[PDB]
Write a protein that binds this ligand. Sequence first.
Ligand SMILES: N#C[C@]1(NC(=O)[C@H](CC2CCCCC2)NC(=O)N2CCOCC2)CCN(Cc2ccccc2)C1
Length: 217
Amino acid sequence: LPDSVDWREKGCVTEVKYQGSCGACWAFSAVGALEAQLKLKTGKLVSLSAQNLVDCSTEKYGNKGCNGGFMTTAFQYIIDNKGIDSDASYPYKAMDQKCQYDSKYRAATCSKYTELPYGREDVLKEAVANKGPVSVGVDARHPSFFLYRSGVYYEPSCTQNVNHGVLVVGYGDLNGKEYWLVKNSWGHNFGEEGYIRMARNKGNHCGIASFPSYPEI
Ligand SMILES: N#C[C@]1(NC(=O)[C@H](CC2CCCCC2)NC(=O)N2CCOCC2)CCN(Cc2ccccc2)C1
């Protein structure tokens, strides 16, 4: 496997988004993963609608819109629905709204998704290298997480009780510290222009490899 990977270098990662006061991280994580596959498949990089998931992948999928959701069930909604609209056609409002999906604005489809084995950082490395960015959940409730600015994030108080959906878009090594390159959805002001390098091969730190999954087209 490559020693390092950065899907941004392959033009497979869209701009960092700002979720605001709506707990839609799960939807942003999910569209981010599909965005990479859509690019790999069609050659075009297109932001997908996080709002479409918030408003439509709801109760039937165990999701609660601005109050939380799952990347896997969001993927299943896209499969069941036979599509997801583009972000431009169905903009993000950081609010729960009525479902307004319209196939005329469809920008991507999904045929299946895969959930990786719990806590295997080696399997996650292989997936990130051979398949593309992977949706994951991390424990981002510690004060240090909100204040992260640079370097590789390692928090002794971190746990494997995850609560925030993000996207691994690569991995590597910085000054002797292995890390996972994570795309967050708290805008460009957060961390490194919206990204955070989180400790890799450090005992499933913050549960980064606890619940990984990726869609395919
Ligand atoms: N956005 C998103 C949130 N998380 C979710 O949506 C998480 C995401 C999942 C991804 C897969 C692994 C487990 C977690 N889900 C979640 O909270 N649910 C799941 C569905 O029922 C409602 C609650 C909403 C609440 N969270 C609060 C928070 C604040 C600060 C730091 C971390 C988490 C952030």
